[PDB]
From a paper:
The Syn6803 RPitc complex was reconstituted using the recombinant Syn6803 RNAP, Syn6803 σA, a nucleic-acid scaffold composed of a 26-bp upstream dsDNA, a premelted 13-bp transcription bubble, a 28-bp downstream dsDNA, and a 4-nt RNA primer. The structure of Syn6803 RPitc was determined at a resolution of 3.1 Å through a cryo-EM single-particle method. The cryo-EM map also reveals clear and sharp signals for most nucleotides of the upstream (−37 to −13) and downstream (+3 to +30) dsDNA, all nucleotides (−11 to +2) of the single-stranded nontemplate DNA of the transcription bubble, eight nucleotides (−6 to +2) of the single-stranded template DNA of the transcription bubble, and a 4-nt RNA primer base-paired with template DNA in a post-translocation state. Our structure shows that in cyanobacterial RPitc, the RNAP-σA holoenzyme adopts the closed conformation of its clamp domain, induces near 90° bend of the promoter DNA at both junctions of the transcription bubble, and accommodates the promoter DNA as other bacterial RNAP-σA holoenzymes. Our structure shows that the RNAP-β′1 and RNAP-β′2 subunits are split at a loop region located at the surface of RNAP. The SI3-tail and SI3-fin bind the loop and stem of the rim helices, respectively; SI3-fin contacts the β-lobe loop that stabilizes the downstream dsDNA; SI3-body extends to the top of the main cleft and shields the lobe and protrusion domains; and SI3-head interacts with σA. The SI3-σ interaction forms an arch-like structure that inhibits opening of the RNAP clamp and provides a physical obstacle that prevents the single-stranded DNA of the transcription bubble from dissociating and rewinding.
Second, cyanobacterial RNAP contains by far the largest sequence insertion 3 (SI3) “insertion” in its β′2 subunit (630 residues in Synechocystis sp. The 630 residues are inserted between the two helices of the Trigger Loop (TL), the key mobile element in the catalytic center of RNAP that is essential for the catalysis of phosphodiester-bond formation, NTP discrimination, pausing, and cleavage of backtracked RNA. The largest by far SI3 (~65 kDa) of cyanobacteria stretches across the “body” of RNAP and interacts with the initiation factor σ, thus sealing the main cleft of the enzyme. Notably, the SI3-head module forms a SI3-σ arch that seals the main cleft of RNAP and stabilizes the transcription initiation complex.
Author numbering:
A (entry chain Z): 1 to 329, 343 to 391, 395 to 424, 431 to 435
B (entry chain A): 3 to 152, 164 to 188, 192 to 232
C (entry chain E): 11 to 68
D (entry chain Z): 1171 to 1224
E (entry chain D): 377 to 597, 602 to 626
F (entry chain C): 413 to 594, 602 to 890, 892 to 1071
G (entry chain B): 3 to 100, 106 to 113, 118 to 131, 136 to 154, 162 to 185, 189 to 226
Write the structure that this text describes.
RNA sequence: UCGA
């Protein structure tokens, strides 16, 4: 037995249920979940968790961040009356200010729930994942945000209050535009997902595992599903419950992975740490007569072992896709720790351009070392083509000032 | 040890009797054992008496009216449901009521037999206005707790038999000894005394632990 | 302990749709053999086919 | 489209375009051998999956 | 009771003629609608071992139809288990569930061996289980294994094993979030932010060295091992021991 | 109204009119507005009633701006709406202002206190659940009411109002007699327990006494769901936001036993039954008492006319009207001819068609009005005597009933605990409802916490606050109103435990079973809960074997006609994804659409030996004959050795 | 109208007895107030015997090690804490001590083999009789922490007897081994009965 | 029309 010496969340409870299935089966796993809910029902009544008004702790830095955000709006409205910015440049400054202000309020809520009191009734329901969510907490103690029109146009007037301070009559009809849009989109979602599930059944109703083996040699190459910069599905999550078609020989010809070997949960972590492209058996490459082979399909994901002869895999495949159908709705920042005068140089042809905001920025279309002045710390920075710089040759920046913004369409009127 | 005393004994206008008791001394953690066990018996196990059935002598069901009375049969049965009565015979009794005149009907106009008394007078029943007459009669039966009603023109009422309304107790420390001091508040409806309800509640708990120490 | 006896029967059989037919075909033999006046209300013929099949499995 | 171009005319007429499948099946003289699901439900027999496989 | 007497009506009538109370169906149907207390004793002996399939519309996945073993309860509603609530996607604000009763002997063996709720822990879509604490039992387990830095009441005490701390929780010795050293000789101790380094190495006499850690205290030459934890985490770890080891 | 609309299929197509909205003679909706002249709201004359012409011409401010006492407007930046866009301009440039903050919402949304603190999705549900609350036996006015309940009670038409400004003379339970002054005795009739359309009561109770001056517009007699003056749809009882032992897990309600024996949430439902003595061509039907095969066990409440009396307690399975029907079959089987020849007792020519009480129905009969011919009323053709029976019953609150509040916190009661098991306050008062606090922060139901904490302040004071929605100073009108009035209730010398300095909206609650206090303080308060029409009695349905369809020979569907549950196409796909092939064949053959398979399956359970292999279902043979009538030669064959013959599925 | 019997009993390898009782018939609501009042008396108000003070030669404080013994002196304070014995309400005496060799002692010792030492040792301890617990703060005999707990675990469940409804109390008592679970129920019932007899008056 |  092992000793869990940490605080138990919802996601740490699902790892305990999945560990009891792999070792003991289904009868002892259901008894573990039957005893874990006697423990949860007993110590929730003994705790006495309750919601109150003052449990919704509004952070005291909200007033200091709302009057600082309105100063950036007041210095933009006065620039609009001088003809220095357009209507699109004024609209891009107002929306990016209030959306950026709500991100500082959302991060201040999580910090204030850990320094003031770790055992808070709103924080316990959201951090443990019982019923709350951070999109629902920020509407209770933070800012509501920027709502949109019934057609989709974001209104420039924000809702600075929340459900604890109370909305106004003007802020209630703006919030009703999204409540009606979210209500009529739910009823049309069930009619589109219901017809999609029916079409997936009739196209795969006669897909029954009839034979044991077919004797094919084709395979399907699977890799890590990376959506550009960040990864979504790892290699260990795709090899789970699928047989092998080729040997994996990474270190010195390692024979730990052979052909037609059932990959377990811990075995998929060993293949993903050696190679990146694994050839597995798939029903796309299956050569069978009006059926899918038993080795080409893989494991039963609800039983933990291989599939049996004579069971419809197409009905389970059509039901697994149509079930979540009703619940389906590039540049970095730069900084400088030293204040001084930048050195442009003749090596970069920094041309003048205009950004999406109402400010001028010299656009650099080539490389170059944007070196700023310093006493002992020579702060240097590299350029990038297509981005823009802000500092001019001869200007003394302040402490921690933004030097530039390096980079790591649709038509509208 | 175990000195029982009464701190105060308040009494409302013939409708409630509040008394404050005290227990000193006790053990290190027996302030909750004596306190909570005496509260659960006083609120659910004390027997009482109330009006079970009413024959109004002229209306067969409950969803009709009487010509001349301000209230119908249903509002009369709700006023007699909260009537405070007591008895000693352990038998269903019969009490009558007549009313002629334009005045209101109170609990003092009843005709109860021997060993059955009305504790609270001036209980509001339906009023008469100068042109009618009420000849209803009621049945007084004893019971424990709350009974479910699931003869000749009798209307059954789901009466209650709880003479004690609310019991409150706090545990206080005395001044090395970890002993406690328990005070108790008993609120009755006048049908029984709080000193008599404490003696009856202590009889049930003492008899619940008689055959657990002799046979074992 | 009936649910613990059913998980041992479904395991080490290689076909969960075939060993449940042998339980249903043995429960009809236990029902025809229990046609006398003695009828146990706790031990149904469908439950007795699972206990007798797990004892002969070992 | 793949649901209507199958070998069974009963499984295609119950899904969509009943007047178009039965018109094509009568002229071509198609034959359903009751293979697979969604036919034995209409016929009234055991499905070939599950415990009705063998 | 009034719904089970209608669903299991041919099974009650067969038991009445077999026991010798009635002789036909007309004598049995008049005895059922009369309301005798002997009829409910027959209905108690019939439903034992008879699976009943429960069903909630709409049926999105295949775990929306599961079989159960019914019991006669008091009231007029179906007492559903709270653990199968994410499976049926059922909420207690007006949901109605359809009840179905099998008849043949082959249908009873398929509802028990293939359609029972205890054998449906894992979902058919992914490999992740759905029978799990969801809303009210996660909050009971988060508060149990939490850390309250104000209500200690006897923190920093050494106890002799797991059973010594359970006997000290029934008394008024320790609280739920007290820092408690527990003598535990096992090495498989998982925790948040684990470490293998040894800080504050203290050496005793006769060559014995004490290996101090962030949460452990191992007496090296392993002789003893003390674990700093809360008594709420000992009650949680004791529940997994009596459920997985039988 | 942007909030009140039904959810589901008709989401947005069926709207509701607002509070101050008015339709002119042309058919356009108008809204009143106050004139603003040079930054000063001219609240002296009548409004303008603009007919939606303020879009491209006028600048309209809502009713939320802070104004002064006839001087000016306090705010410097007034948010307005101009050409369907929101903007903040100068207060000297505006033209019109709204007359009320409840002008946007309807008359049902305005009954929700603290509407600005609740979400718009839960305020949609709170307005729909308020229109489903049953009238209780003794209603009670809310303590956190909005003040608009008095106007909605007089405009409903079920409240007797005075018109003469006179002196009340005689008051009883049936009429109220006053005399007009500056044929002088008018009689106001009072209905007593009349049946409604949704099986509820329409009882009216007298309010005034003899010898009292009245005014035109004064309540003389309130309705069933109406208290004195204002409307009353529920009760004010104690609430606590604490999880019990799994009894309030997922939107479930835990109530106490005190709500049962105090007649709280007890409504009266009056059902109506119907029978008719029609004209059968074999012989005329008449209502008699001597019906065959029914002894003295059901002929106790008849007055030798076949009809029941008034005030008889009927239960499930009784006989309300005994009616016979003549038959002319004369097709007796040889088994029944031998059984009748032994013991005699030759069968009559009549058949018992008596009106009976359905399953799970009981009550007291209150109206046995019979409408026959030659009495002054018209009858439908083919009918001799029309009997109408009205049965009233008193339903208490039970396990399985659906209760809700004014903020969309609906739920179903799962357990009724005694008063010694419920938690209790430190004065000894127990807790009625133990609600779950987990559903509060996930749905943004903040106004229900403001309502219970303010109603608890009105409980200890007895003042019955009236708070209008949509304020005043920000953060000084909702938090410091509740916490400021809770401090005034704690200043009494007898009530010092009501308010705490550390935790303001919380007190210490003790456990009822063990007597030990809980570890954390719990928010208590006086919540206003309603009782909806979705009771547990109307959802019970079961069927062993009943009627069948006309063509497909399948079981019917319906609670009132003993129907069966439908096993649709999504339910077949779950069993097809399972291994349940024998359960799927059983549900489609021996339980539906088989005139032969249903007989052998029912005979197998009574005898005790089940048989396999059911026959061909009836619904396939109907489709086979329908495709042959379309000009398609469709048939079934056999692929056996040297034999290709068509099979006869019908014959 | 009251009967009480034991359903089943069990005893492990160590002397730790266990029994399950049944109380029938109890009134509606009386099953909870009986099982909860018996739980607080059996766990807290029960006299027991334990080791409160030891004395080992050559040891000065609770952190110093003694030559010859593998474990520390804190382990001797923990192994002597779970010593199951009964003093029969006597005056505090002096006990002596000369594999584990737990079978020897200088009072009837119940299960005399749990753990003493694994040396390759002269101890002098005392035995006191009382109720409750005591925590010794640092700063002759070395007083250790002692817990007088003759009953370790009490579990009770209340279910309905029949359908006025009745209740049925199922009481589970996990004793230490010094006293019987049937005997401990008779002692705990004597304490509750002595608190309501002068209260009856 | 109304519930999920
Ligand atoms: Mg639901
Ligand atoms: Zn293959």
């Amino acid at each position: 037995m092992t000793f869990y010496n940490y605080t138990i969340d919802k996601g740490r409870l699902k790892k305990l249920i999945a560990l009891a299935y792999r070792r003991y089966g289904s009868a002892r796993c259901s008894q573990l979940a039957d005893e874990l809910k006697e423990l949860g029902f007993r110590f929730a009544t003994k705790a006495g968790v309750s919601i109150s008004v003052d449990d919704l702790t509004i952070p005291p830095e909200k007033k200091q961040m709302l009057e600082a955000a309105e100063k950036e709006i007041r210095t933009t409205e006065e620039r609009y009356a001088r003809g220095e910015i357009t209507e699109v440049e004024r609209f891009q400054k107002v929306i990016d200010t209030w959306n950026g202000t709500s991100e500082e309020l959302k991060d201040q809520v999580v910090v204030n729930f850990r320094k003031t009191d770790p055992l808070n009734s709103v924080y316990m329901m959201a951090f443990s994942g019982a019923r709350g969510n951070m999109s629902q907490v920020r509407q209770l103690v933070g800012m509501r945000g920027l709502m949109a029109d019934p057609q989709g146009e974001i209104i420039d007037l924000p809702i600075k209050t929340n459900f604890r301070e109370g909305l106004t009559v003007t802020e209630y009809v703006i919030s009703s535009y999204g409540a009606r849009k979210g209500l009529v989109d739910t009823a049309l979602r069930t009619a589109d997902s219901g017809y999609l599930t029916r079409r997936l059944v009739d196209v795969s109703q006669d897909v029954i595992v009839r034979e044991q083996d077919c004797g094919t040699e084709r395979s399907l190459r699977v890799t890590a599903m990376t959506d550009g910069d960040q990864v979504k599905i790892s290699l260990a999550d795709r090899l789970f419950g699928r047989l092998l078609a080729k040997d994996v020989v990474g270190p010195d010809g390692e024979i730990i992975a052979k052909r037609n070997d059932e990959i377990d949960e811990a075995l998929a972590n060993r293949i993903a740490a050696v190679t990146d492209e694994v050839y597995v058996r798939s029903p796309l490459t299956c050569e069978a007569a009006r059926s899918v082979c038993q080795n080409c399909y893989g494991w039963s994901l609800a039983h933990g072992h291989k599939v049996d002869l004579g069971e419809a895999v197409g009905i389970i495949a059509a039901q697994s896709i149509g079930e979540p159908g009703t619940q389906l709705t590039v540049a970095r920042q730069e900084k400088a720790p030293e204040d001084g005068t930048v050195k442009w140089g003749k090596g970069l042809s920094t041309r003048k351009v205009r950004t999406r905001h109402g400010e001028d920025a010299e656009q650099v279309e080539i490389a170059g070392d944007l070196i700023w002045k310093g006493e002992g710390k020579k702060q240097t920075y590299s350029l990038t083509p297509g981005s823009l710089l802000f500092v001019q040759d001869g200007q003394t920046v302040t402490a921690g000032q933004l030097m530039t913004e390096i980079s790591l369409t649709e038509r509208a009127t | 040890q175990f000195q029982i005393e009464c701190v105060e004994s308040s009494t409302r206008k013939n409708q409630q009797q509040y008394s404050k008791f005290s227990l000193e001394p006790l053990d290190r953690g027996q302030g909750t054992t004596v306190g909570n066990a005496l509260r659960r018996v006083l609120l659910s196990n004390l027997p009482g008496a109330a009006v079970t059935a009413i024959r109004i002598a002229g209306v067969n069901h409950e969803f009709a009216t009487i010509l001349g009375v301000r209230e119908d049969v249903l509002e009369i049965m709700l006023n007699m449901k909260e009537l405070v009565l007591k008895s000693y015979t352990d038998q269903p009794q019969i009490g009558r009521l007549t009313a002629i005149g334009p005045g209101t009907v109170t609990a003092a106009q009843f005709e109860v037999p021997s060993e059955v008394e009305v504790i609270d007078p001036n209980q509001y029943i339906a009023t008469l206005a100068e042109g009618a007459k009420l000849e209803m009669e009621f049945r007084v039966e004893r019971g424990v707790g709350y009974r479910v009603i699931e003869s000749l023109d009798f209307l059954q009422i789901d009466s209650v038999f709880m003479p004690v309304t609310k019991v409150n107790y706090t545990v206080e420390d005395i001044r090395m000894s970890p002993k406690d001091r328990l005070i108790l508040d008993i609120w009755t409806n006048g049908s029984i005394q709080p000193r008599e309800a404490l003696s009856e509640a202590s009889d049930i708990i003492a008899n619940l632990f008689i055959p657990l120490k002799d046979l074992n | 302990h009936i649910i613990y006896r059913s998980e041992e029967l479904l395991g080490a059989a290689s076909n969960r749709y075939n060993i449940t037919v042998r339980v249903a075909k043995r429960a009809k033999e236990n029902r025809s053999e229990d046609f006398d006046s003695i009828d146990d209300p706790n031990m149904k013929p469908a439950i007795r086919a699972i206990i007798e099949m797990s004892d002969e499995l070992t | 489209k793949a649901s209507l171009n199958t070998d069974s005319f009963i499984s295609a007429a119950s899904f969509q375009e009943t007047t178009r499948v039965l018109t094509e099946a009568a002229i071509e003289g198609k034959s359903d051998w009751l293979r697979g699901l969604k036919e034995n439900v209409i016929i009234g027999r055991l499905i070939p999956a599950g415990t009705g496989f063998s | 009771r009034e719904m089970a007497i209608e669903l299991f009506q041919p099974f009650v009538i067969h038991r009445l003629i077999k026991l010798g109370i009635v002789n036909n169906i007309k004598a049995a149907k008049k005895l059922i609608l009369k309301g005798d207390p002997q009829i409910w004793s027959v209905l108690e002996e019939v439903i034992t071992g008879h699976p009943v399939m429960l069903n909630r519309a709409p049926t999105l996945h295949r775990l929306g139809i599961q079989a159960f073993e019914p019991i006669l309860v008091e009231g007029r509603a179906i007492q559903l288990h709270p653990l199968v609530c994410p499976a049926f996607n059922a909420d207690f604000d007006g949901d109605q569930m359809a009840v179905h009763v099998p008849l043949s002997l082959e249908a009873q063996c398929e509802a028990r061996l293939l359609m029972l709720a205890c054998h449906n822990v894992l979902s058919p879509a992914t490999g992740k289980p759905i029978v799990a604490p969801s809303q009210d039992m996660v909050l009971g387990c988060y508060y149990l294994t939490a850390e309250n830095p104000n209500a200690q009441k006897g923190a920093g005490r050494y106890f002799a094993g797991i059973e010594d701390a359970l006997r000290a929780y029934d008394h008024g010795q320790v609280d739920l979030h007290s820092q408690i050293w527990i003598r535990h000789l096992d090495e498989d101790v998982v925790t948040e932010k684990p470490d293998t380094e040894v800080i504050k190495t203290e050496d005793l006499g006769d060559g014995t060295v004490m290996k101090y850690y962030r949460e452990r205290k191992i007496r090296e030459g392993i002789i003893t091992q003390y674990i700093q934890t809360t008594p709420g985490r000992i009650i949680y770890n004791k529940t997994i021991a009596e459920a997985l080891v039988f | 109204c942007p909030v009140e609309t039904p959810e589901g299929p008709n989401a947005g197509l069926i709207g509701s009119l607002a509070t101050c909205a008015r339709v002119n003679d042309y058919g356009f909706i108008e809204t009143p507005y106050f004139r603003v002249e040079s930054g000063r709201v001219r609240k002296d004359l009548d409004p303008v009633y603009l007919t939606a012409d303020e879009e491209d011409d006028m600048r309209v401010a809502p009713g939320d701006i802070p104004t002064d006492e006839e001087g000016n407007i306090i705010g410097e930046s007034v948010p307005i709406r101009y050409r369907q866009e929101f903007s903040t301009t100068s207060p000297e440039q505006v033209d019109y202002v709204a007359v009320s903050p409840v002008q946007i919402i309807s008359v049902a949304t305005s009954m929700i206190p603290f509407l600005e603190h609740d979400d718009a999705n839960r305020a949609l549900m709170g307005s729909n659940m308020q229109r489903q609350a049953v009238p209780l036996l003794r209603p009670e006015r809310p303590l956190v009411g909005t003040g608009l309940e008095a106007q909605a009670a007089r405009d409903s038409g079920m409240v007797i109002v005075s018109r003469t400004h006179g002196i009340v003379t005689y008051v009883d339970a049936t009429e109220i007699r006053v005399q007009p002054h500056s044929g002088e005795e008018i009689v106001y009739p009072i209905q007593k327990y009349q049946r409604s359309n949704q099986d509820t009561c329409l009882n009216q109770r007298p309010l005034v006494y003899a010898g009292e001056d009245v005014v035109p517009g004064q309540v003389l007699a309130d309705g069933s769901a109406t208290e004195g003056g204002e409307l009353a749809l529920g009760q004010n009882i104690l609430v606590a936001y604490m999880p019990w032992e799994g009894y309030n897990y997922e939107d479930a309600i835990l109530i106490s036993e005190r709500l049962v024996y105090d007649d709280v949430y007890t409504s009266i439902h009056i059902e109506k039954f119907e029978i008719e003595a029609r004209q059968t061509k074999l012989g005329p039907e008449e209502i008699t008492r001597e019906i065959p095969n029914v002894g003295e066990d059901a002929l106790r409440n008849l007055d030798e006319h076949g009809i029941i009396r008034i005030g008889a307690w009927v239960e499930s399975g009784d006989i309300l009207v005994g009616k016979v029907t003549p038959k002319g079959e004369a097709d007796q089987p040889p088994e029944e001819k031998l059984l009748r020849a032994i013991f005699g007792e030759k069968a009559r020519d009549v058949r018992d068609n008596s009106l009976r009480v359905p399953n799970g129905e009981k009550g007291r009969v209150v109206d046995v009005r019979v409408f026959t011919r030659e009495k002054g009323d018209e009858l439908p053709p083919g009918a001799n005597m029309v009997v109408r029976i009205y049965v009233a019953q008193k339903r208490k609150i039970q396990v399985g009933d659906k209760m809700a509040g004014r903020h969309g916190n609906k739920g179903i009661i799962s357990r009724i605990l005694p008063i010694e098991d419920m938690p209790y306050l430190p004065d000894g008062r127990p807790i009625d409802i133990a609600l779950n606090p987990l559903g509060v922060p996930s749905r943004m139901n903040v106004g229900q916490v403001f309502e219970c904490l303010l109603g608890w302040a009105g409980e200890n004071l007895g003042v019955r606050f009236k708070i209008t929605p949509f304020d005043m100073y920000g953060e000084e009108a909702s938090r410091d109103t509740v916490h400021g009035l809770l401090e005034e209730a704690s200043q009494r010398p007898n009530k010092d435990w009501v308010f705490n300095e550390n935790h303001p909206g919380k007190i210490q609650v003790f456990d009822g079973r063990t007597g030990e206090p809980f570890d954390r303080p719990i928010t208590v308060g006086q919540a206003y809960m309603l009782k909806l029409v979705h009771l547990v009695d109307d959802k019970i349905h079961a069927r062993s074997t009943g009627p069948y369809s006309l063509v497909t020979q399948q079981p019917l569907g319906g609670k009132a006609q003993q129907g069966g549950q439908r096993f649709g196409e999504m339910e077949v796909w779950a069993l097809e994804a399972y291994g349940a092939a024998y359960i799927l064949q059983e549900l489609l053959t021996v339980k539906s659409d088989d005139m032969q398979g249903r007989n052998e399956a029912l005979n197998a359970i009574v005898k005790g030996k089940s048989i396999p292999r059911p026959g061909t279902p009836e619904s396939f043979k109907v489709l086979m004959r329908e495709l042959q009538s379309l000009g398609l030669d469709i048939a079934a064959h056999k692929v056996q050795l040297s034999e290709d013959g068509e099979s006869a599925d019908a014959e």
